[PDB]
Amino acid sequence: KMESRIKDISLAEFGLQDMEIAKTDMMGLVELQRKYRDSKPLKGARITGSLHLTIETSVLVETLYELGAEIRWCSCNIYSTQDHAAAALVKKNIATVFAWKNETIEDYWVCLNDAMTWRNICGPNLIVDDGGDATLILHEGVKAEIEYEKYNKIPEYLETELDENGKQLSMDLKCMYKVLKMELLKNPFRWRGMLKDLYGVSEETTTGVLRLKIMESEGKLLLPAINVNDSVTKSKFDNTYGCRQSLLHGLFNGCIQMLAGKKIVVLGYGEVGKGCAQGLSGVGARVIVTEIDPICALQASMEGYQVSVLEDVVSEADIFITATGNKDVITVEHMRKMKENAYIANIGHFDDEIDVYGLENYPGIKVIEVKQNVHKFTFPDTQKSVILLCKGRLVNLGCATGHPPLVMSMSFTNQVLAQMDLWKSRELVDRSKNTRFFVKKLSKELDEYVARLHLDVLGIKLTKLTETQAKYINVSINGPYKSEDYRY
Amino acid sequence: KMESRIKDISLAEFGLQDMEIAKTDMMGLVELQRKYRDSKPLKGARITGSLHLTIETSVLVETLYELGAEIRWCSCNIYSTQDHAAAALVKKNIATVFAWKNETIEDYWVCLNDAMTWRNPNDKDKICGPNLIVDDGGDATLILHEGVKAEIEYEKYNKIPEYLETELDENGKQLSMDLKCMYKVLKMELLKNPFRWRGMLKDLYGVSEETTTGVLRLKIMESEGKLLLPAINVNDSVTKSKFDNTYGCRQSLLHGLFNGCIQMLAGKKIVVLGYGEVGKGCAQGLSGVGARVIVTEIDPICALQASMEGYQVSVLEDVVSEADIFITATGNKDVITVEHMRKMKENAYIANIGHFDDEIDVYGLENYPGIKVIEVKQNVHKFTFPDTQKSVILLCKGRLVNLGCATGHPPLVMSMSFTNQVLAQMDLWKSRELVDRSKNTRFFVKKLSKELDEYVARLHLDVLGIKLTKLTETQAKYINVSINGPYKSEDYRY
Amino acid sequence: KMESRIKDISLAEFGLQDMEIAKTDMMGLVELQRKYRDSKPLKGARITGSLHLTIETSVLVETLYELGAEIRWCSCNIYSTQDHAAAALVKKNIATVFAWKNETIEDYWVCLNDAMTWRNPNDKDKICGPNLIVDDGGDATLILHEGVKAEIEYEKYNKIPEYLETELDENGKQLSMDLKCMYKVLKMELLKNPFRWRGMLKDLYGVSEETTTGVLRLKIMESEGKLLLPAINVNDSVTKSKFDNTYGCRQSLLHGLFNGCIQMLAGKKIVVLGYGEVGKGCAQGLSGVGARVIVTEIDPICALQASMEGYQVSVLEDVVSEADIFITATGNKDVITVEHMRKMKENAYIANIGHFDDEIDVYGLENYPGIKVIEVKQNVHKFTFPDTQKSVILLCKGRLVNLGCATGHPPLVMSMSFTNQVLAQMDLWKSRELVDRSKNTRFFVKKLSKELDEYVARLHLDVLGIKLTKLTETQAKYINVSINGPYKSEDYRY
Amino acid sequence: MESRIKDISLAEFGLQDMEIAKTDMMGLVELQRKYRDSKPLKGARITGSLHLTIETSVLVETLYELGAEIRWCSCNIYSTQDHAAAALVKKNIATVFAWKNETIEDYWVCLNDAMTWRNPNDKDKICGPNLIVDDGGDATLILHEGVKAEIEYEKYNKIPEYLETELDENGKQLSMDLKCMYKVLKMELLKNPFRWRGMLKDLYGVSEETTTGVLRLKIMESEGKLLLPAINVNDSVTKSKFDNTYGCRQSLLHGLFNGCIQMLAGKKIVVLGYGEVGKGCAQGLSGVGARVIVTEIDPICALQASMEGYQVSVLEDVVSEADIFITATGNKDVITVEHMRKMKENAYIANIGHFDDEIDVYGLENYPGIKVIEVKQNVHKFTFPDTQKSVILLCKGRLVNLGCATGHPPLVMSMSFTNQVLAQMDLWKSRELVDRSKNTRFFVKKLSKELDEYVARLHLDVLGIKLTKLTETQAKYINVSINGPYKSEDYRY
Ligand SMILES: NC(=O)c1ccc[n+]([C@@H]2O[C@H](COP(=O)([O-])OP(=O)(O)OC[C@H]3O[C@@H](n4cnc5c(N)ncnc54)[C@H](O)[C@@H]3O)[C@@H](O)[C@H]2O)c1
Ligand SMILES: Nc1ncnc2c1ncn2[C@@H]1O[C@H](CO)[C@@H](O)[C@H]1O
Ligand SMILES: [Cl-]
Ligand SMILES: [Cl-]
Ligand SMILES: [Cl-]
Ligand SMILES: [Cl-]
Ligand SMILES: [Cl-]
Ligand SMILES: [Cl-]
Ligand SMILES: [Cl-]
Ligand SMILES: [Cl-]
Ligand SMILES: [Cl-]
Ligand SMILES: [Cl-]
Ligand SMILES: [Cl-]
Ligand SMILES: [Cl-]
């Protein structure tokens, strides 16, 4: 496909308006445009992006374009796209987009595959990823081509509708496999052909980084990678403060009830859980925390929160928010013990945290649409119901518009810097000898730079060290100011 | 009009779903239905309501209906109606509704007038008014009193009064759109029947007023001896002012800002003008998500309260150029002027949470010479001045942002406010016989008792799993109160 | 007793230093001194005070002195006196003081009686009483009323009444130490002069009551027609109840706990019994340092307020075995019983912040069969039950922890409370002539006006750099108030 | 030989507080229960330089129950709790040299005494400790400076001139701490010029408790001057994220409430430094209604403060209007005399960073014609002669939480001290690998994440925390062991 696939081009005007307003606070991206718009450090680069296509993301895409790159983009979640944002990008020819709000799981993988396809067929030079789906289709595509040549037929794991243990494959796996199968019939050298020109990936979130580290250990990582999620100016701000506002927005839109005085269980008290808890407390809720890490559990106590095992609180709590990045944290057996009209939502990257499949396929269960992406499930034996927000997917992006511009600018300034780093290192990626790669992070020098670029947004005034002071604490006047192990 | 005027009847199904979910937390109204649905304490009563037609309001209307009343309803703001809620009411024949989201100011007054019009049960042909009124902001009460004034002035000179035909006030300034459109309706009614409004007085037994601003208008009429019917101040029940006004807004304001303002609130300087019941709640919510609240206030006691909560207290002039967002919660007039807005910084957001659009000089802004306006989104406008080229974003034309850009307060707290409403309506209706107009031309404003105020609270304890302690005989005697209450003096401030 | 009784006069220098520092924030008292030191509105008045003798109280006493009054003072609690503050007053001859930290209950009543005793200015040999009383808790008011009762009963049978000699109450139970020691003083005074107390009535013009508990005792006397002098309820001024009671305790409780309890508050389950003016503040402070507050309450309205602030509301029975710390703020009796304390866990801390030691059954605990007690530190005792071998730590024998283990509320907020006191004393004194005892005559309890309540707040705005906004003529008219106030209705709850 | 303390009769009150404190110090209670029989530290001589509080008494008791002989001194002239010191000497747990309100001269004599041990083989001779528990780096400093002084003594065969002078290399007066330390080093060169180097033979390591002391250790490591192995206890997650932050949240307030008579609500309080400590200080101050203004040099920390609703300014722009100033930088000359002269009447100034350098106290006390008066125990009001304005300083610019109050509470100190005991056990168990016949560089290391999580587990029951346990599938999905560790080494919590 050389032209874009979006919902409505006429929404472009509203998108450009929001983009300009958003830029007031996205000073990091505005500075990169101002500074590098003439020198074009990314000239000639082909960038494919798999990341929530929001207004904030449009400014990221615009920044990459102003720096000389050609762009192809898709969203990393079926409900997160903002149609007016997508329209703005195609209206100005900044990028070729394959994204719309409320995609089917089938269309999600077709869009991702389209975004990965470039014309003279070849692939991208760089990848901006959030969740690891773009990275996954690449690696699984290479595996599928190896297995295809070995037996000279379509591999049986792609045609079966079951996994290795007899259980149904997830819809995401079936739809991806379906795309990989269609591509083996067109060209069985497609994916391995892309490797010649791939110079790296920037990964945005915790869950995607986990998938990258697993590949690194096993020696299966096929391109350089930069962990953007673990920059201080991303994990300590986006993950925490972003969700503090973003979760509330999502709950206010999907849940009609008052949060004050309710017992709200936050499962997981990591970077995201901490923020969720702050916001919920901020509007009068009584947060109960669930956690497996004894250090994180103690942190929750120190902030005045009760720490319990879900089993002891499931019958009495009013709302459940999963923020673990784990699997089967809320089971169907848990949901049956919940009380009438208990709300369930997820803010971790995938829909595995809540057993949504088990709930939808429960024998004789009744489901009704309460509103746009909010469903009420009623069990036949007890006659009790539970309300699920946007089928267990990211509520902050599914029921609302995700994090606001200021924090996304910090996350995206890191992305641009990561893309520039990977591109500037092209020459060192020699595949005639080195087919195996590692995950690295951006330096603390750049991490502090990202923070400096956003100080004027909030009228912050930094103090400057004197020569003597700098020497006393043993740091340079211009930084960095802390050790690599410092936790902020 | 004997049939309803709404946006879309097919949205009724979604409305009934939200109503059932909302009822999980609205235990006060659910209890009143359970208790009085058989005895019908309001049987035969004709109730007209002028109050934001939200899902929460649908449950209020349903409660009044289950208690035997016939209902006619309209919204008290052009942007607050939830079309699916309105559809649910007409779908089940609970009430006759005249309301839709995004009404014109002209249609607002026509809807209110329609809601006030009833067909005479004796002679299905003639016109009469309601027996009771549920009001929020005082507009239903205003059209009644101004209608009576207009009829007095009509008979005196035997012609349409000149104050209704002019488009200017007593000083040469343009009348507000709300006054022109109301006057236009009063004029049309003088041509149909010049005894319409005074005719309604025979059967009017009272009004329940929901908000601070409407109560102010009632107290002014009481002092001047111009109040034409009994009134109950629902806003000053402890279970309304200390919960709805404060905790309702804590959530409700944030919802409105999140929907209308795309920016992050954390670290921003947000000015909350007015630190009363509403301002206090607004400040709590804003702080809750990391904002730096600056407070403006005229009351030295309220100003000190703000300091004790860690907030800076300043005059708007000293903070207008640096602050990022402005929230008016004063119940006053011209708190944000055009001269203030010109000194604001690029893309500063302005919003109002007090009952009317007077707090911000919206008329002055829209009519500023050579100003450019553009719609950022549904009910959000960006105004750009021609000389400085700087812009300000206004949320829903300076009207209630919590109801204009969002869905207002959540069910739990509205159930507390509405349980008071039902009790007020039952009180006014039960006192009918004492309202003798052949002699008593003087009416007053009263409040519900503390006994009932505590009752409202008891009805909602199970929603949040609250467990009350019960006094022993000795304890009750020691603190000099009954085991069953009331537990505090009338002057207690909670 | 011409001369004072205090612990150590050499501590006077430190007291005068703290007084000057405290005055930086006590702008209300500093303004009254500046304004009235020349005109002496209280010249010739004899004032007896029964109120915690802290540095803050020294500035109150100094203010009354600069306004022309002669002063005699005692503390209203055996642990609250700050010896350096008492020394400062006697060093400068501002007042005659009878107070020291760690008084015995016996000495407490002797000090109060001494403070009530004055030398007749006409005939130096004879005795008389005060003209005005500054009271906190109602003990000065109590000894007066019980003294009059004792004299009536003395003349009736011409002998010492038997209720004063017995060590038991009407049901066989031991009298409280406070009753025994007061009775012992009243008995001595009947032997010196059986017309002493009734003689004081001739010149008594009123009492200013500082706290909730004392006001309750005044209202009971008012109903029964037993109140023998005019009274002003200072506690219910907005600038007292909404600041002192709430914000004072937010800091003051923490100070007390940090000094008496060695443990960390963060993450602990702390039960606050009573969520009134004081409880609300206690909860804010505790949350502020990471505690998990659980609330007990009998009032459904107050219970709901606690929920809205994110606190769990439970009955003590359901949380007594698991909670770590217990804080009583009810103004009630037997809220923590010995049966409750036996179910508590090892080294659970128990403290009280309500005015008297009745909230916790301290007598029952100290007299429990075979119980072992040990002093952990200055005014902190650990009690160990013999059967379970478990222990509970009690802070300063169940008396005011904020004043017993720490120094009470800080200057800023006490200045607001004490500015009301001075204004109350001036009011009572200026009304002398209207107090005619040759006639019926029932006395009542009244409050200060809102005009004065706002005045108190204005006097403290500069302390925190608060900038008030001023209403325009139009704005004042729109909201129907004077530009200079008052700004709210009498029923407004702030 | 025998201890030096204020009053032995206060011992009974100390033992009472120790037992109460142990209810929450479950980490130390568990170590005692577990290792009291096997005595993993048997035969070890431990010298400690750390605030002698009730909490510290439980640490000392734990080390004793594990078989060590102990000598102890405080690491600050105002932090000692006399009843705690008395308790240790009453039960013969340790030999103590500490009392509240020491003179700077006596502080260094106490530290030197604590470092002195009687040779077990030949009772006549002197030796040093095997292990050192340090907080601030003073025990580590006297050792290194003592070795330097002995090298310079033999070279020139005379007392080095830098020890006799009362001035530094630029003509400025030496700090009292340097003069008094030098005075002790000089006296020891006259008794025995091989004393300090003699201790090196048996030194197996030091556990450093605080940020500032770690900085001093890292400087020595870079320069190749570190003379013994070291463990950075301060950077364990169960120390920096709890003690530094949550400890101060309560501890600062306690100090201010005791030293400052004023109400904190509504006041503009400047917290200089928004690091681990600053964050906690700000939380507590906000908790009681103050309006916190933050000062910071780090753009990342500055942004963190904004996100919590705090204004971030340079001191110059807020010094005339702010009411209270709290230094938490670990830096030098953050509050100067020129700053204090611009402050308003009765502005309060306090420090919570480890040393008194953050505030120019020397400059203030020695200002021409200044008047000083004692407001109370360790609180002084200084009045400038030209403007007539005054500033109140809390405990001469030293740790206000420990100077005006009792420091952090037991729960968090148990977490910090459980790390200490584990560090001491680690250093002692590695003795054999410390071979000085080969002159190797010594480095600073940290405890493992396995142990860091262990410390947290030991304190879960104190607050009734209930941990969830991962299933086999879950553990595999997130790629961790069911028993941990649960996070990567770079994770910031
Ligand atoms: N009182 C206590 O009980 C206690 C407890 C723990 C640590 N400490 C001490 O507190 C100090 C700080 O500890 P930490 O762990 O927070 O250190 P940290 O590095 O975490 O924080 C120090 C902060 O100060 C900032 N800073 C440095 N110089 C500055 C200047 N001139 N102006 C503004 N900001 C400046 C740094 O950027 C940093 O954010 C250390 O001296 C440490 O020993 C004391
Ligand atoms: N408004 C937004 N636009 C784009 N990405 C977002 C937004 N809000 C959150 N995210 C990203 O989505 C990721 C989770 O999929 C987060 O780690 C975050 O970086
Ligand atoms: Cl619990
Ligand atoms: Cl490093
Ligand atoms: Cl229509
Ligand atoms: Cl200011
Ligand atoms: Cl002009
Ligand atoms: Cl005597
Ligand atoms: Cl005057
Ligand atoms: Cl519960
Ligand atoms: Cl054992
Ligand atoms: Cl030499
Ligand atoms: Cl030299
Ligand atoms: Cl500012």
Residue C159: CB atoms within 10 A of its CB come to: 11
Q: Which residues contact D349 (CB under 8 A, 6 or more apart)?
A: D324, D325, D335, D340, D343, D359, D391, D392, D393, D394, D397
Q: Can you tell me whether residue D480 is helix, strand or coil?
A: coil
Q: Which of D50, D210, D308 to mutate to test the pocket of ligand 1 (most atoms within 8 A of CB)?
A: D210
- Is the distance from CB of B46 to CB of B116 less than 8 angstroms? no
β-pair partners for D373: D381
Q: Which of D215, D313, D470 sits opposite A292 (nearest CB)?
A: D470
Q: Which CATH architecture has domain B247-408?
A: 3-Layer(aba) Sandwich (3.40)
H, E, C per residue of C288-309? HCCCEEEEECCCHHHHHHHHHC
- In whole angstroms, what separates CA C447 from the centre of its chain? 17
CA dist A283 and A278 (Å) reads: 9
β-pair partners for C296: C273
State whether the Cα torsion D260-D264-D269-D273 is positive or negative: positive
C310 interaction partners in chain A (CB closer than 8 Å): 260-261, 281, 284-287
Residues of chain C with CATH 3.40.50.720: 247-408
Buried b (16+ CB within 10 A) or exposed e, C208-243: bbbbbbbbbbbbebeeeeebbbbbbbbbbbbbbbbb
D290 interaction partners in chain B (CB closer than 8 Å): 310
- Is the distance from CB of C143 to CB of C113 less than 8 angstroms? yes
Which method was it determined by? X-ray
CA dist A259 and A318 (Å) reads: 9
Element (H, E) at D4: none
- Is the distance from CB of B493 to CB of C488 less than 8 angstroms? no
Q: Tokens in use for D479?
A: 């790629």
Measured CA distances, D447 to B307, D24, D207, D233 (Å): 45, 23, 11, 7
C:106-165 residues touching chain B, CB 8 A cutoff: none
Residue to substitute from D300, D307, D318, D321, interface B, most B β-carbons within 10 A? D307
Has B153 been labeled as part of a binding site? no
Which residues of D are known catalytic residues? 51, 74, 79, 135, 209, 234, 239, 243-244, 248, 354, 408, 416, 420
- Is the distance from CB of C414 to CB of C56 less than 8 angstroms? yes
Measured CA distances, C328 to B485, C248, C361, C400 (Å): 21, 16, 11, 10
β-pair partners for C168: C174
Closest listed residue to residue D329, CA positions, set D307, D308, D304, D350: D350
- Gap from CA of D404 to ligand 13 centroid (Å): 39
Length of chain A: 488
Q: Report angle CA D478, D479, D484 to the nearest 5 degrees.
A: 100
Give the strand pairing for D45-49 and D324-327. unpaired
Length of chain D: 493
Q: Tokens in use for B49?
A: 């309501």
- Is the distance from CB of B115 to CB of B74 less than 8 angstroms? yes
Atom of ligand 1 nearest to the CA of D330: 41
Residues of chain C with CATH 3.40.50.1480: 1-246+409-467
CA dist C51 and C136 (Å) reads: 5
Q: What is the torsion angle, in degrees rounded to the nearest 10, for the CA atoms of residue A335, residue A336, residue A341 and residue A346? A: 10
What's the farthest any 2 CA atoms get from each other in chain C?
75
Distance from CA of B301 to the nearest CA of D (A): 14
CA dist B429 and B423 (Å) reads: 10
3.40.630.10, 3.40.50.1480, 3.60.15.10, 3.10.20.30: which CATH number matches A1-240+403-461? 3.40.50.1480
Closest listed residue to residue D440, CA positions, set D217, D229, D132, D232: D229
Breaks (C-N over 2.5 A) in chain C follow: none
For B47, list phi and psi in degrees, rounded to 5: -115, 125
- The CATH H-level superfamily of D1-245+408-466 is Adenosylhomocysteinase-like (3.40.50.1480)
Q: Kindly name the residue from C74, C76, C249, C261 that is annotated as catalytic.
A: C249
Peptide bond into A124 cis (omega under 30): no
DSSP calls for C126-184: SEE--SEEEESSSHHHHHHHHHHHHHHHHHHHTS--HHHH-SB-TTSPBPPHHHHHHHH
Length of chain C: 494
Q: Any idea which residue has 């602030």 for tokens?
A: C309
For C347, list phi and psi in degrees, rounded to 5: 55, 40
Residues of chain D with CATH 3.40.50.1480: 1-245+408-466
CA dist C335 and C329 (Å) reads: 10
- Is the distance from CB of D274 to CB of D301 less than 8 angstroms? yes
Q: Which residues contact D24 (CB under 8 A, 6 or more apart)?
A: C263, C264, D409, D410, D411, D414, D462
CATH no. for D246-407: 3.40.50.720
Distance from CA of B332 to the nearest CA of C (A): 6
By the 10 Å C-beta count (0-12 exposed, 13-18 middle, 19+ buried), D124 is classed as exposed
- Is the distance from CB of A61 to CB of A95 less than 8 angstroms? yes
CA dist D407 and D402 (Å) reads: 4
Closest listed residue to residue C232, CA positions, set C207, C203, C201, C213: C207
Q: Can you tell me whether residue A387 is helix, strand or coil?
A: strand
3-state helix, strand, coil in chain A (%, to 5): 45, 15, 40
Q: Say if B302 is an interface residue toward chain C (CB within 8 Å).
A: yes
The dihedral region occupied by A14, where left means phi > 0, alpha psi between -120 and 50, and beta the remainder, is: alpha
Per the annotation, the verdict on B355 as an active-site residue is yes
β-pair partners for A48: A72, A127
C:397-416 residues touching chain D, CB 8 A cutoff: 406-407, 409-413
Q: Tokens in use for C154?
A: 């003395």
Give the strand pairing for D117-118 and D94-97. unpaired
| Pocket-forming residues, ligand 1, beta carbon under 6 Å | A 463, 465, 469, 473, 481; D 210-212, 244, 248, 272-278, 295-298, 301, 328-331, 334, 352-354, 399, 401
- Return binding residues of A: 52, 54, 56, 77, 130, 204-207, 234, 238-239, 270-275, 291, 326, 347-350, 396, 401, 403, 482, 486
Measured CA distances, A116 to A119, A134, A181, C291 (Å): 10, 8, 16, 52
Kindly provide the residue ranges of all beta strands, DSSP E only, lying in D267-404, ordered along the sequence: 268-272, 291-295, 311-312, 324-327, 347-351, 371-376, 379-383, 390-394
Q: Which fold has domain C1-246+409-467?
A: Rossmann fold (3.40.50)
Distance from CA of C202 to the nearest CA of A (A): 56
Residue C418's identity, in one-letter code, is: F
C:309-368 residues touching chain A, CB 8 A cutoff: 309-312
By the 10 Å C-beta count (0-12 exposed, 13-18 middle, 19+ buried), C339 is classed as exposed
| Pocket-forming residues, ligand 2, beta carbon under 6 Å | A 52, 54, 56-57, 130-131, 204-205, 238, 242, 349, 397, 401-403, 408, 411
Residue nearest atom 27 of ligand 1, based on CA coordinates: D329
Q: Which residues contact B7 (CB under 8 A, 6 or more apart)?
A: B83, B86, B87, B100, B101
The chains found to touch B (3+ Cβ pairs under 8 angstroms) are A, C, D
- Is the distance from CB of C394 to CB of C350 less than 8 angstroms? yes
Q: What is the Cα Rg of chain A in Å?
A: 23
β-pair partners for C47: C71, C132
The chains found to touch C (3+ Cβ pairs under 8 angstroms) are A, B, D
Q: Any idea which residue has 């990964």 for tokens?
A: A203
Kindly provide the residue ranges of all beta strands, DSSP E only, lying in B25-140, ordered along the sequence: 46-50, 70-74, 96-98, 118-119, 127-128, 132-135
A427 DSSP 8-state letter = G
Q: Tokens in use for D478?
A: 């997130």
Ligand (nearest to CA of A481): 1
CA dist B154 and C222 (Å) reads: 57
CA dist D312 and D320 (Å) reads: 16
CA dist C431 and C41 (Å) reads: 12
Q: Which residues contact B195 (CB under 8 A, 6 or more apart)?
A: B151
For C395, list phi and psi in degrees, rounded to 5: -90, 125
CA dist C255 and D82 (Å) reads: 21
β-pair partners for A378: A366, A385
Closest listed residue to residue D250, CA positions, set D374, D400, D384, D124: D400
Q: Which residues contact A93 (CB under 8 A, 6 or more apart)?
A: none
A38 DSSP 8-state letter = T
Q: Report angle CA C83, C89, C95 to the nearest 5 degrees.
A: 125
What's the farthest any 2 CA atoms get from each other in chain B?
75
Q: Any idea which residue has 């243990």 for tokens?
A: A165
Q: Say if B288 is an interface residue toward chain D (CB within 8 Å).
A: no
CA dist D78 and D69 (Å) reads: 25
Residues of chain D with CATH 3.40.50.720: 246-407
Q: Which fold has domain A241-402?
A: Rossmann fold (3.40.50)
Closest listed residue to residue C332, CA positions, set C368, C313, C364, C359: C359
- Is the distance from CB of D390 to CB of D237 less than 8 angstroms? no
Please indicate whether, in this complex, the C-beta atoms of C24 and D261 are within 8 angstroms of each other.
Answer: no
Distance from CA of A339 to the nearest CA of B (A): 11
Q: Any idea which residue has 């809540």 for tokens?
A: A354
Residue C415: CB atoms within 10 A of its CB come to: 33
Give the strand pairing for B70-74 and B46-50. parallel
Q: Tokens in use for A212?
A: 């990258």
The chains found to touch A (3+ Cβ pairs under 8 angstroms) are B, C, D
CA dist D488 and A259 (Å) reads: 34
Closest listed residue to residue A18, CA positions, set B172, B34, B382: B382
Distance from CA of A174 to the nearest CA of D (A): 20
- Is the distance from CB of C75 to CB of C102 less than 8 angstroms? no
- Is the distance from CB of B288 to CB of A282 less than 8 angstroms? yes
Which residues of A are known catalytic residues? 52, 75, 80, 130, 204, 229, 234, 238-239, 243, 349, 403, 411, 415
Q: Which of D301, D465, D484 sits opposite A298 (nearest CB)?
A: D465
Closest listed residue to residue C397, CA positions, set C433, C371, C365: C365
CA dist A298 and B174 (Å) reads: 64
State whether the Cα torsion C97-C101-C106-C108 is positive or negative: positive
β-pair partners for B273: B296, B328
Query: What is the side-by-side order of every strand in the sheet holding A95-98?
Result: A95-98, A70-74, A46-50, A126-129, A200-203, A225-227, A439-440
A167 DSSP 8-state letter = P
- Is the distance from CB of C332 to CB of C359 less than 8 angstroms? yes
Per the annotation, the verdict on C50 as an active-site residue is no
Q: Which of C24, C290, C376 sits opposite D246 (nearest CB)?
A: C290
Buried b (16+ CB within 10 A) or exposed e, A244-255: bbbbbbbbbbbb
Q: Which residues contact C383 (CB under 8 A, 6 or more apart)?
A: C341, C365, C366, C368, C371, C372, C373, C391, C392, C393, C394
Q: Any idea which residue has 């997981």 for tokens?
A: A268
Q: Say if C469 is an interface residue toward chain B (CB within 8 Å).
A: yes
Residue A463's identity, in one-letter code, is: T
- Gap from CA of B265 to ligand 6 centroid (Å): 21
Measured CA distances, C264 to C208, D55, D412, D413 (Å): 39, 12, 8, 10
- Is the distance from CB of B271 to CB of B318 less than 8 angstroms? no
Element (H, E) at A164: none
Has B65 been labeled as part of a binding site? no
A250: Cα within 13 Å, side-chain hemisphere: 34
CA dist D104 and C30 (Å) reads: 41
Ligand (nearest to CA of C114): 8
- Is the distance from CB of D53 to CB of D21 less than 8 angstroms? no
Measured CA distances, A125 to A117, A189, A191, D428 (Å): 11, 17, 13, 55
Closest listed residue to residue D321, CA positions, set D297, D339, D301: D339
Element (H, E) at D198: helix D195-200
Q: Report angle CA C28, C29, C30 to the nearest 5 degrees.
A: 90
Q: Report angle CA D101, D102, D108 to the nearest 5 degrees.
A: 155
Q: Which residues contact C163 (CB under 8 A, 6 or more apart)?
A: C153, C183
- Is the distance from CB of B228 to CB of B145 less than 8 angstroms? yes
Atom of ligand 1 nearest to the CA of D400: 1
* Ligand 4 is an ion; residues with CB less than 5 A from it: A 483-484
Q: Say if A454 is an interface residue toward chain B (CB within 8 Å).
A: no
Q: Tokens in use for B392?
A: 């300000």
